[PDB]
Symmetry: C2
Subunit: 285 residues, 2 copies
């Protein structure tokens, strides 16, 4: 379908648009390159583990590698729908979003390669709840935007992607990585990568908050849709958390070897806390 | 539609894929930020011009600002179609492509703002041939990919976008900018921007060559489709070139003021040369 005009021919960028400002920050804070991370110490750490200590870390890496890959692919329909509404500054920012996610995919794949599990298929650690969110509901809600860009549809896409997948699960995964392996002194390259990912994620979540809030602001009834879509996904959120928890409670040789009181009750409550504070960043009014 | 698996969970990135290597180079060579360009000298240059010297430079800026904006929006369907075919490394690279184009839009808009023409609507310098390529045929060929990702459709999208819009028109515009204003000592910020754009453009054109060649390689008959779609667009290419040429031949006060023998016959032959060497970068075999 045709371009009727061009904003930067008729006028300029809206330099005060929040998403143009977030775009600017993304360029400033987005220079990191996963190709510069030194994973040589991670290779040695991983090889030094027992086979039982080795399994301990694979579930979380499985959940993240697919997370990053899903969101790299699944942001495209959001950029399309906003482009078609003429929201140029949103699109500018989203180019940084998509590129961040490509780096995230790259970072986890480089780690798997470097530690020697690239040839191992980690799909086994995706249980039914994980598959529901990442194999199904995330691509459903995003691909919807190709044919339905109603406020309802846009809110639901930003809820699943930015508020749940990123704002709840990814954020809790970053915390979990630090609580466990940063305590242990293991896997320094991977944790440098996690620190960069977590910084990028702040912008991703702010795009979701801005997107959701700008639609709530038009019609306070969309607040309820937001809460509702958060609650609809919680069962799968926690059911993946319990599944990982059981996996860790059954494989505790890395816990004992490195003197890590892995506090699953505290990881669980951090997930709960993430979920509820994402709610509280959307004002009904 | 659902993800069946994830390549970086089952395996890794194909680290030897040409588009993964181009992605890597894009990160290394893609750090420039239009927000760092100093346009203060451009503001003074532009204000020092006569009204007749002022008009001289606006057509080319009009053609480019819409070019960058069109290609920022219109690359999205290519990333989608390749994502859906599972071509992960292509997608990784294309995130750098889309972000480059956002910076290109940004660069021209910052110049217009800084020199004081942001509020002026430059659409008047888009004649009928330009509108056919950029308002119509480019978005048609790209949006097609949402519903038809046949080799025919992919070849035609890369021909219009990478080989014509970028590989022929943009490349000739860069040359034209240097031949004219770099000679004059005018507009140093803008020309720094053009140098960065031209570097980015090399990767864009190589994605198009790779994309077109990998389909030609399957079936040598697609070579003819390539040539044919190049020839179909040439009339509008040159008809925009003639239109700009007449505009410059009629407004030659900037030419005289800065002692610039503007050689339109040489700009024309450079456009012709670009068009033909893009053909010669696709091997029929
Ligand atoms: C203790 C397990 C809870 C952490 C959530 C991990 C989310 C993810 O890995 O994508
Ligand atoms: C002498 C005019 C020929 C240069 C082609 C300019 C292409 C563009 O401005 O997008
Ligand atoms: Fe990510
Ligand atoms: Fe993210
Ligand atoms: Fe460009
Ligand atoms: Fe380009």
């Amino acid at each position: 379908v045709h371009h009727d005009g061009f904003q930067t021919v008729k006028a300029t960028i809206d330099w005060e648009h929040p998403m143009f400002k977030l775009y600017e920050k993304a360029k400033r804070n987005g220079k990191w390159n996963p190709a510069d991370i030194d994973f040589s110490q991670d290779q040695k750490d991983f090889a030094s583990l027992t086979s039982e200590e080795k399994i301990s870390a694979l579930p979380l890496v499985a959940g993240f590698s697919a997370l990053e890959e899903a969101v790299t692919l699944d942001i495209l329909p959001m950029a399309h729908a906003l482009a078609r509404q003429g929201r140029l500054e949103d699109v500018l920012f989203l180019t940084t979003f998509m590129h961040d996610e490509a780096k995230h995919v790259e970072m986890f794949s480089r780690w798997q390669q470097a530690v020697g599990i690239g040839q191992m298929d980690l799909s086994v650690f995706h249980n039914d709840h994980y598959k529901r969110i990442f194999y199904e509901a995330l691509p459903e809600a995003m691909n919807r935007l190709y044919a339905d860009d109603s406020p309802e549809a846009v809110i639901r896409a930003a809820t699943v992607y930015n508020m749940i997948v990123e704002g709840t699960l990814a954020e809790s995964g970053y915390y979990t990585f630090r609580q466990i392996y940063k305590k242990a002194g293991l896997f320094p390259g991977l944790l440098q990568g996690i620190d960069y990912l977590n910084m990028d994620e702040g912008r991703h979540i702010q795009f979701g908050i801005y997107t959701i809030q700008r639609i709530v602001n038009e019609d306070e009834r969309y607040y309820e849709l937001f809460i509702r879509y958060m609650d609809e996904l919680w069962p799968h959120v926690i059911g993946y958390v319990d599944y990982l928890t059981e996996l860790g409670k059954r494989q505790q040789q890395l816990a004992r070897t490195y003197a890590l009181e892995i506090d699953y009750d505290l990881l669980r409550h951090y997930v709960i806390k993430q979920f509820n504070l994402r709610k509280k960043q959307i004002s009904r009014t």
